[PDB]
Amino acid sequence: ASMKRKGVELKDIKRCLGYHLDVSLAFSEISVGAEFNKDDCVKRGEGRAVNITSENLIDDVVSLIRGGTRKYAFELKEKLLRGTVIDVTDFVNWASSINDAPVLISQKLSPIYNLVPVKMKNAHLKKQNLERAIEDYINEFSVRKCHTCQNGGTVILMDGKCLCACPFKFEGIACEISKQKISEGLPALEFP
Amino acid sequence: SHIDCRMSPWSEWSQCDPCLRQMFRSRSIEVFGQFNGKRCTDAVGDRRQCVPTEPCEDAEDDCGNDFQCSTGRCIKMRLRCNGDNDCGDFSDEDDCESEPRPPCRDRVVEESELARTAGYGINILGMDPLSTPFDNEFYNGLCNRDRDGNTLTYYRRPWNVASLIYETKGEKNFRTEHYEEQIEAFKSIIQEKTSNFNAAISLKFTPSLHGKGSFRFSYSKNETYQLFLSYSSKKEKMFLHVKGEIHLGRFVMRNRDVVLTTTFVDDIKALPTTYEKGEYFAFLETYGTHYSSSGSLGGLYELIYVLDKASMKRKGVELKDIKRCLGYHLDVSLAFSEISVGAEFNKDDCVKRGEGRAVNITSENLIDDVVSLIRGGTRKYAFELKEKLLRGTVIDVTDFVNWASSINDAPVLISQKLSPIYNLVPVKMKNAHLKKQNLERAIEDYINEFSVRKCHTCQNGGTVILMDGKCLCACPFKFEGIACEISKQKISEGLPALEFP
Ligand SMILES: *[C@@H]1O[C@H](CO)[C@@H](O[C@@H]2O[C@H](CO)[C@@H](O)[C@H](O)[C@H]2NC(C)=O)[C@H](O)[C@H]1NC(C)=O
Ligand SMILES: *[C@@H]1O[C@H](CO)[C@@H](O[C@@H]2O[C@H](CO)[C@@H](O)[C@H](O)[C@H]2NC(C)=O)[C@H](O)[C@H]1NC(C)=O
Ligand SMILES: *[C@@H]1O[C@H](CO)[C@@H](O)[C@H](O)[C@H]1NC(C)=O
Ligand SMILES: *[C@@H]1O[C@H](CO)[C@@H](O)[C@H](O)[C@H]1NC(C)=O
């Protein structure tokens, strides 16, 4: 983001006045003269300039990886992040490493109370009891019951701490302070 | 301010405990001291020997069920000579008349340096978690397989630990931003004035008689004024924070039906029941305030640094010039028949004025703050990552694998689910219930007794901390140190006075 604003003002005024008075009177042997001249000029000047530039930049990078042995996994991570040169053997090493140690990708889900063994002591009543328990668990505490953050900050819940992820252009906790304050300008005369 | 510690409110002597043989002279903490004055770490509590007067008939029987151990615990159903280590190395295996029947035939390696030590006593007002307040080696019956992990190896899960996962979760974030501010102002003012005057009059008379006279007068004046003013200021700010964690494993301690260690059991057995805050405050610092219901082995690292820029420029120029001049001419000539009279008077006077003023003042301010931290793994591979991360700009591929292996060798807590201690006390004990509510009141009085809430507030919004009595306040970046009194930003001083010598 960038912003540029320019304003220039110039003012000049000149005003002048001119006056001439001449009177001459003549007797037979009498002579009278008079000469009055007036001159006055006035000049005015004013100048104004405004030059204000503003620029804003925002960058966010995130990345993650998982699976395989610790040696071959992070060897791919170091060369992937701003490496720009991917190898042919490192991917085969990563494949062998993840063959040695895989991890979950996609998971189809199923409730636990359907897994309880049948024809047990009190299987059925315990089944519906654990169903009510899991319902009360999933509807008891979550982001739904916590408080909403500011500026549309996505609220998370990490073991009691009900923090909210604030957007990029905004500052941290509680999303209160903006972090973008319109530049302040004071054209006042310096005191000392 | 040399703030002293008003920290001696004394209480009355309570009744002597006959079984414990201790007295309860009580006390309380009131004032810490926010400034560099007298530090006061005086602990609350006092003990005294007392002659017991009650017969102390209350005692803990040996569970009336089965073979008593050498420390106070009991076999439930199968804690006999079956390779089940509960009390000591050979304490439970003291005498074995039957054959040493192994509990499990498969080869399962013991939990080496892993979450086996799952007990943690983190202090919400203190620091990093504590050690295990309970025994975590005891197991009840048939081995529960833990067929998971990086390599092909089988670990054991104790009966006290309800669950343990080997999920190698890992995430990290990045962020950055930019702020920009600029202002400029130009001003120019000019004035011009000119004044001129004329005055000429002549008089002559001739009707011998003759007369002649002439007056002349002039005037000159101009005053030019000039003004110039300029203003400029620029500001820039950059703030960003990043963090990453390498999760190793997660465990969830079983809440109830929990076995305890001999030392903690002995401490709970030798424990008062008349609300002895003095001994309870010691027990709290000894075994933490509340234990961990679930932890997260691994390690995290994060680096932050901050940038701030400020600039100011002010310019003012003034020029003043004035010229004024005067002119006068007088000439009179008189003529007789043979008589001649003359007169000539001339006057000239000019005046000039000059003045100049200039103002040129530049100011610039910069603020930078950088912080970073790391933990976990062996000391060799951990700080080898730290040196190359800090301003290295070239991350290796092998160093991260070395860090992964190092943190696999030695992990550390990342996320910790919390649980109060008074829920961990064993049930059906001597005075378990009353001791339970007593320790609950004790932990409540601990968490509400001394904290930043009771200390004094700092200045300029300085975040106040408490590090073992010293109630210091973290002052902002643009401000100076302790007590946040001196600003550290003083408006530049300017003196245009004439030099004395
Ligand atoms: C406002 O004034 C600044 C003065 O820095 C202008 O930036 C350029 O500055 C250089 C050197 O100072 C001059 O040689 C250029 O002529 C200036 N550019 C222009 C277009 O005059 C800036 O461009 C001006 N305008 C704004 C909106 O900031
Ligand atoms: C005030 O005066 C200083 C004088 O240093 C100005 O800085 C520049 O200085 C160099 C060498 O001294 C001159 O050649 C430049 O002409 C000066 N700049 C300008 C714009 O005249 C400074 O810029 C002046 N103004 C302020 C606000 O400090
Ligand atoms: C006198 O008159 C002339 C001509 O009008 C003018 O230019 C001048 O300013 C006047 N004043 C003087 C010479 O002081
Ligand atoms: C005003 O007088 C000053 C003094 O020398 C001169 O430099 C300037 O040119 C004069 N201005 C006008 C408009 O006559």
Residue numbers in the entry:
A (entry chain V): 344 to 535
B (entry chain W): 18 to 224, 242 to 535
Lines from the paper:
The multiprotein membrane attack complex is a bactericidal weapon of the innate immune system that also modulates inflammation and proliferation when formed on self-cells. Previous electron cryo-microscopy (cryoEM) reconstructions of the complex revealed that the final MAC is comprised of 6 polypeptide chains (C5b, C6, C7, C8α, C8β, and C8γ) together with 18 C9 monomers that are arranged in a split-washer configuration. Based on structural similarity with bacterial homologs, the giant (110 Å diameter) β-barrel pore is formed when helical bundles in the Membrane Attack Complex-Perforin (MACPF) domains transform into transmembrane β-hairpins (TMH), although a molecular mechanism for how this occurs is not currently understood.
We used 3D classification procedures to computationally isolate two stoichiometrically identical conformations, open and closed, which varied in the extent of β-barrel closure. The open conformation is characterized by a 30 Å wide chasm that runs the length of the complex. C8γ is wedged in the crease between the rotated asymmetric component and adjacent C9 oligomer, and may limit the rotation of the paddle. In the open conformation, the first and terminal C9 are latterly shifted by ~20 Å, while the ring of the closed conformation remains planar. The hinge region of the open conformation was resolved to 4.9 Å. We observe density for many of the reported glycans on C725, C827, and C926, which line the β-barrel’s concave face.
